[PDB]
């Protein structure tokens, strides 16, 4: 109804969008290490 749920929505959205970006490179490095 107001910002009460919007705050947690913004928090989780920022968390997931940061996590995917910071973990794509980690997944690529893991794949490269497994397939050197």
């Amino acid at each position: 109804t107001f910002e009460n749920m919007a705050g947690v929505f913004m928090l989780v959205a920022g968390g997931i969008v940061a996590g995917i970006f910071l973990i794509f490179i980690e997944i690529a490095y893991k794949r490269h290490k497994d397939a050197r």
Partner: protein, 36 residues
């Protein structure tokens, strides 16, 4: 009372419909970008 409508929750009712669209779009974009 109207269940799952603006009076029930999210009285703005004109933001989540585009929020889901934009988060789906960014998820698709990152999935495409992380393919290689």
């Amino acid at each position: 009372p109207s269940a799952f409508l603006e009076p029930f929750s999210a009285s703005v009712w004109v933001m989540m419909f585009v929020m889901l669209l934009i988060v789906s779009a960014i998820a698709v974009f990152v999935f495409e970008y992380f393919s290689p």
